Amino acid sequence: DVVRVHPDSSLAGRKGYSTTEGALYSYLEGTRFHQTAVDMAEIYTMWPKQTEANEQVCLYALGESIESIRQKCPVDDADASSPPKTVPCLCRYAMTPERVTRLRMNHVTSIIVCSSFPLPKYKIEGVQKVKCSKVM
Amino acid sequence: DVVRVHPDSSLAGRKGYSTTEGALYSYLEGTRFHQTAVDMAEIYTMWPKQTEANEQVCLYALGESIESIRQKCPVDDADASSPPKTVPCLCRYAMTPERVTRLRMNHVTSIIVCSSFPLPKYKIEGVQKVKCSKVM
Amino acid sequence: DVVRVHPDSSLAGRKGYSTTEGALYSYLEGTRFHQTAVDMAEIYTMWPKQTEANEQVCLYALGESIESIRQKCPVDDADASSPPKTVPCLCRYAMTPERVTRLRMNHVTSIIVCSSFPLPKYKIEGVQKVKCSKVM
Amino acid sequence: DVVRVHPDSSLAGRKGYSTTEGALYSYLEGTRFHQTAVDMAEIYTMWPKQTEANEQVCLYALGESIESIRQKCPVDDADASSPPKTVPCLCRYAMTPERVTRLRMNHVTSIIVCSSFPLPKYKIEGVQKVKCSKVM
Amino acid sequence: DVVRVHPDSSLAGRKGYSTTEGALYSYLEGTRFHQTAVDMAEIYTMWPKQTEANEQVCLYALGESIESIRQKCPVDDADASSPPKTVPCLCRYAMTPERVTRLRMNHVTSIIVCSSFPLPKYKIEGVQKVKCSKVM
Amino acid sequence: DVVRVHPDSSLAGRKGYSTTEGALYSYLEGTRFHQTAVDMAEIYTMWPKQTEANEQVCLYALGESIESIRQKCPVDDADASSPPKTVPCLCRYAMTPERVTRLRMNHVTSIIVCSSFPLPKYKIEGVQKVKCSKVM
Numbered sequence: 001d002v003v004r005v006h007p008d009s010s011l012a013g014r015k016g017y018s019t020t021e022g023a024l025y026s027y028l029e030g031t032r033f034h035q036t037a038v039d040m041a042e043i044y045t046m047w048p049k050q051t052e053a054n055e056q057v058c059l060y061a062l063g064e065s066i067e068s069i070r071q072k073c074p075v076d077d078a079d080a081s082s083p084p085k086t087v088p089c090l091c092r093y094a095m096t097p098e099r100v101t102r103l104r105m106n107h108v109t110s111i112i113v114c115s116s117f118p119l120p121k122y123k124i125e126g127v128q129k130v131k132c133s134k135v136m
Numbered sequence: 137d138v139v140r141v142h143p144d145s146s147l148a149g150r151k152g153y154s155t156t157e158g159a160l161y162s163y164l165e166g167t168r169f170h171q172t173a174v175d176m177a178e179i180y181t182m183w184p185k186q187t188e189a190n191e192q193v194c195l196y197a198l199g200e201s202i203e204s205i206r207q208k209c210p211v212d213d214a215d216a217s218s219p220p221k222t223v224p225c226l227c228r229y230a231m232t233p234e235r236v237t238r239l240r241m242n243h244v245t246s247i248i249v250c251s252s253f254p255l256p257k258y259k260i261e262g263v264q265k266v267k268c269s270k271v272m
Numbered sequence: 273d274v275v276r277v278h279p280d281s282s283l284a285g286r287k288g289y290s291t292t293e294g295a296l297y298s299y300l301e302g303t304r305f306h307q308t309a310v311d312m313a314e315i316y317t318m319w320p321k322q323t324e325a326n327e328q329v330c331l332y333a334l335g336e337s338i339e340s341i342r343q344k345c346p347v348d349d350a351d352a353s354s355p356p357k358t359v360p361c362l363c364r365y366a367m368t369p370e371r372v373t374r375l376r377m378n379h380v381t382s383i384i385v386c387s388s389f390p391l392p393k394y395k396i397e398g399v400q401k402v403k404c405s406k407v408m
Numbered sequence: 409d410v411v412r413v414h415p416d417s418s419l420a421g422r423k424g425y426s427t428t429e430g431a432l433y434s435y436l437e438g439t440r441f442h443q444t445a446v447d448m449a450e451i452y453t454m455w456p457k458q459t460e461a462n463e464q465v466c467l468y469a470l471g472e473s474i475e476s477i478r479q480k481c482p483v484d485d486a487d488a489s490s491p492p493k494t495v496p497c498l499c500r501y502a503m504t505p506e507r508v509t510r511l512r513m514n515h516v517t518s519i520i521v522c523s524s525f526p527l528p529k530y531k532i533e534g535v536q537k538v539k540c541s542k543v544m
Numbered sequence: 545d546v547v548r549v550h551p552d553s554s555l556a557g558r559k560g561y562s563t564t565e566g567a568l569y570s571y572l573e574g575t576r577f578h579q580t581a582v583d584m585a586e587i588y589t590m591w592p593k594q595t596e597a598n599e600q601v602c603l604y605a606l607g608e609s610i611e612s613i614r615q616k617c618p619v620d621d622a623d624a625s626s627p628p629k630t631v632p633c634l635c636r637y638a639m640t641p642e643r644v645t646r647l648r649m650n651h652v653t654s655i656i657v658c659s660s661f662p663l664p665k666y667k668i669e670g671v672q673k674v675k676c677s678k679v680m
Numbered sequence: 681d682v683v684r685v686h687p688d689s690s691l692a693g694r695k696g697y698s699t700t701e702g703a704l705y706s707y708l709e710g711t712r713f714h715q716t717a718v719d720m721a722e723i724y725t726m727w728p729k730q731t732e733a734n735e736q737v738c739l740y741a742l743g744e745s746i747e748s749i750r751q752k753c754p755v756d757d758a759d760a761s762s763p764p765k766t767v768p769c770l771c772r773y774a775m776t777p778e779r780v781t782r783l784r785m786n787h788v789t790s791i792i793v794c795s796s797f798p799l800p801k802y803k804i805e806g807v808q809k810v811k812c813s814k815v816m
């Protein structure tokens with residue numbers, strides 16, 4: 001089965017990845033983003049509600065270690081992680097595991113997050129919220 | 137999709153930008169004005185009503201930092217920012233993100249703002265209000 | 273009788289092993305994984321409930337000696353070991369005796385375990401829990 | 409193929425260069441002006457319309473670095489550069505790559521530009537516009 | 545069979561190489577450029593689309609190690625490499641394996657690339673895009 | 681019966697060996713490559729599928745002992761070995777027993793393997809995959 005990827009994904013036009021069809025959730029096995037993917041997946045289990053889970057994902061993109069993310073979880077409950085969305089949205093600010101990997105490699109001090117990535121209504125340092133131009 | 141720009145815009149006659157048709161709202165991705173654009177967009181969220189939002193935008197054009205603009209917001213609520221108007225009007229005083237970028241680069245101590253950019257009825261230092269010659 | 277093996281098993285396409293049919297439980301006689309298999313089988317007897325038995329199996333995969341595993345058993349009761357599942361699931365993280373053998377040979381410091389391998393709800397060092405893509 | 413050069417060019421009467429015939433566009437390979445040529449070519453791509461491209465070329469002749477010229481471009485689009493005109497006109501003020509090289513070497517604070525080099529209708533510091541005595 | 549080479553190639557006028565006829569693809573066995581050739585070929589497999597493959601080739605010419613190029617590939621898929629074009633074009637900026645070898649030997653900090661070598665529309669450090677004077 | 685050998689084989693033009701006709705499979709009795717041949721044959725029995733058998737052959741060419749190759753086999757089943765192909769292909773990278781013998785004598789740290797020698801789609805250390813110029 002082919003894994004659906006973002007149109008701007010570097011996996012586009014590759015064997016096992018497609019832009020117009022495929023699986024919408026994946027750990028991206030066989031790529032480097034795989035690691036980031038599973039880390040993001042673990043985050044989405046540590047915080048069941050999407051808002052503060054996305055806040056922790058944004059902090060992860062800003063270079064914060066995943067170990068501190070595990071530390072910040074209120075409980076020690078550990079459940080199996082579901083694969084993160086490979087295409088959360090279709091704009092250039094989609095918080096895919098690939099984009100998070102790229103931001104962590106670039107060590108960016110600020111990121112731009114679209115509205116398809118719901119965040120806490122209060123300010124987050126290094127995160128700028130913009131409208132999602134086009135959604136999934 | 138092409139992004140509609142001002143007739144006096146430096147993006148006129150370029151790939152992805154047009155004067156007679158295109159998107160009327162954009163963060164101007166791929167340009168420098170992009171940064172100014174998103175900043176202006178954030179301002180338009182900090183002040184929901186257009187009058188004092190435009191006052192803050194005018195102060196932004198006069199060189200005041202965006203950090204102080206965030207400080208001046210009465211609340212800490214942060215919602216996703218909608219793209220600013222690329223063509224608020226068709227005169228030479230259109231408060232486009234490009235014009236704001238140019239004014240900030242020139243470090244102007246006074247600006248001229250047309251009537252298509254609604255402002256508070258009281259005086260604003262460094263801002264002169266004139267009639268908009270032609271509107272959108 | 274043919275022994276059913278994982279699709280990613282190195283025993284696939286060999287005499288006595290098959291992917292689409294065969295025995296679902298085996299000590300894998302005639303292979304090296306045999307040893308690991310019987311060790312895993314012994315673990316599954318030392319801990320009757322699958323959760324902490326799988327925890328001990330995960331620790332076994334992380335390089336911990338089987339002698340310490342025997343030491344950690346609360347009782348000295350020793351009953352005959354049933355053959356471990358050759359195909360616990362169909363994803364790439366199936367905790368087959370072959371996969372455990374490969375992980376022990378590679379001396380990995382961290383493993384990824386799918387949801388078809390039930391584990392304790394608390395954190396286990398060196399183990400990352402992910403959803404099983406496809407099950408048996 | 410011979411490259412057509414200006415009658416006042418120092419490449420006149422040389423192998424591969426001619427005054428009465430030859431290629432009207434060239435990067436001037438094998439000369440020093442080559443570098444200036446390609447820089448001018450890049451300018452002509454950064455600004456698609458000839459007017460502000462010629463303004464940037466005039467600023468380049470006045471000693472301004474090409475890096476700042478790249479900075480001043482509104483977009484980051486980079487397309488292949490076409491060779492600049494070796495003979496834009498036949499007067500002594502022809503803005504050939506050779507003339508630009510000579511002006512940059514002399515570090516002139518003011519230049520005279522003929523009417524065959526279309527410029528913005530507003531004043532440019534250090535540039536004096538005169539009629540082109542004879543054109544191509 | 546003779547291998548067609550660039551008119552400016554140092555292999556011109558040699559046994560097994562010709563300018564007017566021959567094979568248009570080769571690993572250049574028997575030469576030093578052979579190594580560069582196969583490296584370039586591997587690059588063209590790592591990035592299936594010609595644009596970012598040519599970007600990686602340009603970075604290779606700028607002295608970046610091939611090991612880092614392998615690292616930068618999003619996937620670990622490795623398919624057989626097709627021989628690179630010995631004559632991608634007929635101008636002096638043809639990105640032949642010989643030219644890449646010469647540039648790597650000279651340790652150049654900047655290269656000039658013609659339009660027959662398609663590159664990403666954004667800026668690449670140390671690469672200047674010019675029109676290809678004559679094509680294949 | 682004559683044994684068909686590679687055109688670049690040192691057995692070419694010898695009694696019992698020919699380039700245009702002969703047996704396509706042989707243990708190469710009477711030569712030194714004989715030993716390598718039978719070793720390769722044994723490898724082709726240890727791994728029934730050609731892909732990982734060729735991977736093990738490539739590792740054998742890189743100097744790894746045949747005893748470790750026997751150790752790496754998942755099973756202890758030992759069936760009679762069929763003679764390896766004396767001419768797997770007609771290019772210079774043909775993985776003949778003679779070429780493997782030469783590479784082992786030279787103790788090469790890297791080899792180039794054509795596409796007629798199918799290998800695993802993942803990277804193999806010391807092996808570079810290129811297109812086979814001409815096949816059998």
Ligand SMILES: [Zn+2]
Pocket residue numbers: 089090091092093094114115116117131132133134135
């Ligand atoms: Zn979005």
Ligand SMILES: [Zn+2]
Pocket residue numbers: 225226227228229230250251252253267268269270271
């Ligand atoms: Zn107006």
Ligand SMILES: [Zn+2]
Pocket residue numbers: 361362363364365366386387388389403404405406407
């Ligand atoms: Zn599973």
Ligand SMILES: [Zn+2]
Pocket residue numbers: 497498499500501502522523524525539540541542543
């Ligand atoms: Zn003139």
Ligand SMILES: [Zn+2]
Pocket residue numbers: 633634635636637638658659660661675676677678679
């Ligand atoms: Zn060219």
Ligand SMILES: [Zn+2]
Pocket residue numbers: 769770771772773774794795796797811812813814815
């Ligand atoms: Zn071959």
